[PDB]
Structure 1
Amino acid sequence: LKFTTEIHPSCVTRQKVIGAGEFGEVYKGMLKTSGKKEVPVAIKTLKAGYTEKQRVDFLGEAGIMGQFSHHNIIRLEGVISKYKPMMIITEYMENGALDKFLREKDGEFSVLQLVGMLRGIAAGMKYLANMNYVHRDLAARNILVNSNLVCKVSDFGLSRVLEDGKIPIRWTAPEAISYRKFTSASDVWSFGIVMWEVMTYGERPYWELSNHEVMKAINDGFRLPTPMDCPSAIYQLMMQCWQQERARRPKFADIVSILDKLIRAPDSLKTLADFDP
């Protein structure tokens, strides 16, 4: 907790319940920081009657989050560790999880807007990779969206094991599943899956094909198909992220550079509807 500001509980106001977390309920609320405008926050609490492992994992997640300082990584405001219930306090992301958000807004964004969301995610991952942090659990359900449409990588939980706190197979690179080689290049594979989630407005990768069939299909060369209206350069980028040989995948710095070029040449993101309504 040397990486975290300790907050007195009288500075926090819980206002409404917004979800259930691994360790307890999550609230939207307000935080008073050092006689100034109170700021909106998300408040994760540790359920009373926690075990000692749960307490360590809970506070350890805040310790990890406090080591990061990037526009596209969720900002930790501080922790309450000296009073009960213990809390992790972060910036508030009004639009919630990216996958759920896009499913509710199906077809309601421009392609340029969606690509800008992907660029922000890639910038956050570029920052993490540069700090030698391998996420291992990158998926749209772990990216939060604020009222300005900024996407931020947001779940840094410690109690994570691979599926079959679960890391699901459908987002995981083949070498990480088969040989437990989790690296920034396996996070790049996961980023390709996120790109597909964004471009489909939150469809489930591989639909309801089973886990065993997924790993069989993938190791046979199957890849998710192009979403409707998806720019060719964007789908080809997903395909590069899904190269079987990890050394052939782009780095996150490459992904950011490519997405920036597409944003600068926006005609590259246009579909038929943009030429014939």
Structure 2
Amino acid sequence: TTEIHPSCVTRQKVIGAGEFGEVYKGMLKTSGKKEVPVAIKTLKAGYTEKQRVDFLGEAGIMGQFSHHNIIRLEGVISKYKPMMIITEYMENGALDKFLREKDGEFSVLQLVGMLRGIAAGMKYLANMNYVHRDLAARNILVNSNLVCKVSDFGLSRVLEDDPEATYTTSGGKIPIRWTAPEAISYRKFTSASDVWSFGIVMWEVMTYGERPYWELSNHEVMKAINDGFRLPTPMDCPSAIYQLMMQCWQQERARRPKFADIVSILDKLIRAPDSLKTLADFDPRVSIRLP
């Protein structure tokens, strides 16, 4: 892992914060070249052994990856305190908030392109034998080219740190509305449970960041899923896209597409973009009648 001297890092603005460090936007000097914008996460003094292992472990995992749709690591400060992880800077931030702040501003083809990128990053991770466990729009980052990159890596720290992941009756901490039934029921997290999550992300993207299952409680979500109910079609959603998200939500893990199948289908739809003009029917909640 590239070790960066602290004199090369200028933290400029807090963009996220937690009890044991912050995330900053800043600049990285890498004498001749212009400084480059970066994101910087810190780990403050007094950290425990487990915190150090988890913090640097995220950097270690990220350093094993080289893919357009996976956040790129610039390096770490580990020889000086506070320790830091430095990555590329994603100008548009988290995908969930981005979509909610840009409601209706993109074309269907742009939205599907975002899903293609996410799927390519997930195919890469699954092929690398990395199970994400927390795939959700809140853990995707977006740059000024609209490229979506998978974020949030690690072992126990991922679900521990995400406030959407809640303690269950069985004792595990999981983000219920994004998690496959086998992962909820018996702690079985695999690339196929990540495919379930990806289907939820597809729904998030096509609804501009609606909250999955709206106000249903976590218990009610699990009950509906076990009863066979599934999220309904977003408004303005290509039929092929809704069909694909439905396949991701098969109860039987073995029936779900693999990420390779998802990427292939999304590629083909984008290459023949008229295919996206055929929309799934939308079930209205409200009737407007006028004579």
Query: 138, 141, 144: which one pairs with 2:138?
Result: 141
For 1:245 and 1:89, the matched residues in 2 are separated by 40
For 1:163 and 1:13, the matched residues in 2 are separated by 29
Could you say which residue in structure 1 is the equivalent of 2:5?
8
Q: Give the drift of 1:162.
A: 6.1
Label 1:220 to 1:130 Cα distance change in 2 as closer, same or farther (>3 A): same
Q: Give the drift of 1:32.
A: 1.3
SS at match of 2:280: helix
Q: Deviations over 1:76-107 (max 9, x none)?
A: 00000011111000000000000000000000
For 1:128 and 1:108, the matched residues in 2 are separated by 30
SS at match of 1:59: helix
Greater Cα shift, 59-68 or 26-35? 26-35
Q: Give the drift of 1:158.
A: 2.9
Label 1:138 to 1:265 Cα distance change in 2 as closer, same or farther (>3 A): same
**TM-score, reference length from structure 2:** 0.89
For 2:69 and 2:20, the matched residues in 1 are separated by 24
Q: Give the drift of 1:35.
A: 2.4
Q: Give the drift of 1:37.
A: 2.0
Query: 189, 198, 205: which one pairs with 2:205?
Result: 198
Greater Cα shift, 156-165 or 254-263? 156-165
Aligned residues: 274
8 Å contact 1:97–1:145 — kept in the other structure? Answer: yes
Query: Percent identity of the aligned residues?
Result: 100
For 1:275 and 1:121, the matched residues in 2 are separated by 25
Greater Cα shift, 6-15 or 29-38? 29-38
For 2:113 and 2:78, the matched residues in 1 are separated by 37
Q: Give the drift of 1:74.
A: 0.2
- The root-mean-square deviation of aligned C-alpha atoms, in Å, is 3.0
8 Å contact 1:12–1:29 — kept in the other structure? Answer: yes
**TM-score, reference length from structure 1:** 0.93
Label 1:172 to 1:29 Cα distance change in 2 as closer, same or farther (>3 A): same
Greater Cα shift, 82-91 or 28-37? 28-37
Q: Give the drift of 1:23.
A: 3.7
For 2:153 and 2:161, the matched residues in 1 are separated by 21
Q: Give the drift of 1:48.
A: 2.9
Label 1:84 to 1:265 Cα distance change in 2 as closer, same or farther (>3 A): same
- Could you list the runs of 5+ residues in structure 2 that have no partner in the other structure? 163-172, 284-290
Q: Give the drift of 1:164.
A: 14
For 1:129 and 1:212, the matched residues in 2 are separated by 29
Label 1:10 to 1:170 Cα distance change in 2 as closer, same or farther (>3 A): same
For 2:119 and 2:22, the matched residues in 1 are separated by 29
For 2:155 and 2:99, the matched residues in 1 are separated by 27
* Structure 1 segment 49-60 matched on structure 2, within 5 A: 49-60=46-57
Could you say which residue in structure 1 is the equivalent of 2:95?
98
Q: Give the drift of 1:267.
A: 1.2
Q: Give the drift of 1:265.
A: 1.4
For 1:17 and 1:52, the matched residues in 2 are separated by 25
8 Å contact 1:229–1:271 — kept in the other structure? Answer: no
Label 1:274 to 1:226 Cα distance change in 2 as closer, same or farther (>3 A): closer
Label 1:76 to 1:34 Cα distance change in 2 as closer, same or farther (>3 A): farther
* Structure 1 segment 169-208 matched on structure 2, within 5 A: 169-208=176-215
8 Å contact 1:160–1:167 — kept in the other structure? Answer: no
8 Å contact 2:114–2:148 — kept in the other structure? Answer: yes
Q: Give the drift of 1:57.
A: 1.1
Q: Deviations over 1:167-199 (max 9, x none)?
A: 311111001111111111110000000000000
For 1:76 and 1:17, the matched residues in 2 are separated by 19
8 Å contact 2:99–2:208 — kept in the other structure? Answer: yes
Q: Give the drift of 1:50.
A: 2.1
8 Å contact 2:96–2:138 — kept in the other structure? Answer: yes
Label 1:271 to 1:107 Cα distance change in 2 as closer, same or farther (>3 A): farther
Label 1:5 to 1:21 Cα distance change in 2 as closer, same or farther (>3 A): farther
SS at match of 2:212: coil
